[PDB]
Structure formats: structure tokens, C-alpha cells
Amino acid sequence: FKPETWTSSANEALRVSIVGENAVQFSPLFTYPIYGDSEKIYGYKDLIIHLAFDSVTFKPYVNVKYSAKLGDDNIVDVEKKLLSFLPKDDVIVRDEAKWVDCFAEERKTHNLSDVFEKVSEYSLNGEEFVVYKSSLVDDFARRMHRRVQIFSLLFIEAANYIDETDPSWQIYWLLNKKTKELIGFVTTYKYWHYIDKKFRAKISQFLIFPPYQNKGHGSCLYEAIIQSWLEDKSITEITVEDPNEAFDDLRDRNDIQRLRKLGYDAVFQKHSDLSDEFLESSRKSLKLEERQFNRLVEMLLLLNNS
């Protein structure tokens, strides 16, 4: 018999791919939100779950394949499970040609420049990239969000789907200027506690799709959002919601470099510390959260520890 022939790792079985010039395939970092804590699937032989997205519109495509399957009652429906996390009635299953027709057609009217507000632009290896932002009230943004949303669960541990009806949500979209392909996205939250109003802005989910990582995007995208928030007088403080090891490292690298270009390198090189009211005034200037500010101060001290 051997029950391992019917058991498979959900991380190895689920193959995700973003399709543009060609399909670039990769594995998820996490599958437990969908296939359970053990991240194992029981009851299928030669299991292969294909999850693909158009590089521009992110139109989902699903295709589950297996050589055989168990007849037991409680054998999990691999396909149904995946679909439950994907946008309802927006996924093309099995019919690959139908999928291509759908997205090649949609690619015609698909334009984020007509509905979204541009936030910034930058260049990495000759190519231009644009950062746009939007709420989740309009149909277009809601549609795109429900398509890319699953990436948070597959690559960000402890992530959960946000409530799209909460008006405090605002997404930032990073795309290739000329090709309009979605490179990454960021869900942010404007909240306060106690003429115009003030708010604290926090980064909740930050994601650059796997085929585009390690190229400088996350840094540029982060810097674009921060610089944007710094310029917005209504934003009091900028904080990050439960960052992981990788994001902490990114947050720190860009924060350090921003403070240094402002000359803080030398300010924290004054052998007599500094006033509390001065540390407060500068923390407010930088809009950083106290915990982060103090960490940055610490890093800037051993850096130039004379």
C-alpha cells in the first residue's frame, strides 16, 4: 500500500505562476491558511495544482491534476478549497484557452491611470515604474485586490484577508510603466484615536511578487510611500503592522539611509547625547514611531561610535 503515495506537501503541489511574456513559475512559502496547519494533502497521487495569473490583470486560472484519488468520504476537495480563497466567479478553471481570451480581452480597457492617483515614479535597469494608490470602494480596485489578495496568505506568515468595506483602507499599486504589469502592492491603513483631521498611517501588507524580488523594488516602493506620507501634513505618525524578519531588514536599511541624507549621521555624533525635547521634535519631524526611532538612534550610535 504505502500511504505516502497518497500524501503530498501542499507547498510542493501548489505551483503558482505569473504569465506575461512567459510563465514564471514558483512555490508558495505558506499553504496552511488553505490546506491546514500540517500543509499536507492526503488522498491524491501525482497531485499538481496550477494557479496562474495574467501579469497585467491578474486574472486567475486554476487546474488540479492527479493520476488517482482515494474514495474515502473526508478526502478534501483540493480544487474547491483553493477556489474559496480566490474571487467568486472570476476564476477560469481547466479551460486554458478561455482564460487567455478573457484576459487578452480585458487587457484592452485595463487602465489604472484613468482611475488611480499617481504617487511617484522611478527607474531600475532602464525601465520606468509607477506607484499609484486607491481606495477599495470602486469596482475596479476591489476586483484587482481580490485577485492579488491570495499572495499575502501564500507569502506572508500570519496574514489574514482585510475587510474591503472598511473605508480606512488604501492600496498602493506598483506597475511597470510601459507594460502595465503589476509588480507588487501594499495595503495601508489611515486611523486616528483623538477644519481638517490628523491620522496615523500604517503599512499592513507589503508584497512584491516573487518574479520581481531582489531587484530594488521593495526599497523604492517603500521609500515612495514614506516620502509621500512625509509630505502629507495630515499624517502624524508612520508605523508598521507586525513586520517579519525580511521586512524589518528592509525598513531599517531605507530608514537609516533617509536619516543619513538628512545629516542625522552627524547629529548622533555629538558626544553629549541630546535633549529629550530635541529627540521628540526630531522624531516628530521624521514621522517615525518611537520604537523604530529609538532603534534607529541605537544603530546610528555604534555606526559612528568614536
Ligand X SMILES: CC(=O)SCCNC(=O)CCNC(=O)[C@H](O)C(C)(C)COP(=O)(O)OP(=O)(O)OC[C@H]1O[C@@H](n2cnc3c(N)ncnc32)[C@H](O)[C@@H]1OP(=O)(O)O
As annotated, the active-site residues are 241
3-state SS assignment for residue 148? helix
Residue 242, all three cell numbers = 507586525
- 253 carries a ligand binding annotation: yes
Q: Which stretch binds ligand X (CB under 6 A): 54-62, 81-89, 246-254, 260-268?
A: 246-254
Q: Is 170 annotated as a binding-site member? A: no
Q: Does 128 sit near Ca ion (CB under 5 A)?
A: no
Q: Map residues 6-45 to x or -, x wherever contact with ligand X holds by CB under 6 A.
A: ----------------------------------------
Cell numbers standing for residue 191:
486611523
Closest to ligand X by CB, 68 or 246: 246
Kindly tell me which of 146 and 217 has the beta carbon lying closer to ligand X: 217
* Residue 217 near which of Ca ion, ligand X, none (CB within 5-8 Å, type-dependent): ligand X
Shortest gap between Cβ of 295 and ligand X (angstroms)?
15
Tell me if 213 is assigned to a ligand binding site.
yes
* Binding to Ca ion in span 235-264, by CB under 5 A: 242
Is 207 assigned to a binding site? yes
155 binds, among ligand X, Ca ion, none (CB under 5 to 8 A by kind): ligand X
Grid cell in block for residue 154:
501564500
CA distances 106 to 97, 100, 116, 178, Å, are 14, 10, 17, 17
Q: Does 176 help bind ligand X (rule: CB under 6 A)?
A: no
Residue 51: CA count within 13 A, CB half-sphere: 26
Candidate list 68, 104, 246, 262; residue touching ligand X; CB under 6 A: 246
Q: Which is nearer to ligand X, 44 or 212 (CB)?
A: 212
- 52's contact among Ca ion, ligand X, none, with CB below 5 to 8 A by partner kind, is none
Q: How far is the CB of 253 from ligand X (least distance, A)?
A: 6
Half-sphere exposure of 74 (CA within 13 A, CB side): 0
Distance CA 90, CA 35 (A): 21
From the CB of residue 279, how many other CB atoms can be counted at a distance below 10 Å?
15
Residue 128's nearest CA partner among 146, 149, 150, 113 is 113
In sequence order, which residues have a C-beta less than 8 Å from that of residue 150 and are 6 or more positions away?
51, 85, 86
Least distance to Ca ion from the beta carbon of 242, Å? 5
Residues in the chain, overall count: 306
CA-wise closest residue to 213 among 191, 184, 239, 243? 184
User: Among residues 78 and 150, whose Cβ is nearest to ligand X?
Assistant: 150
Residue nearest to ligand X (CB): 218
Cα–Cα distance between 303 and 306 in angstroms, integer?
9
Stretch that binds ligand X, among 18-26, 84-92, 136-144, 201-209 (CB under 6 A): 201-209
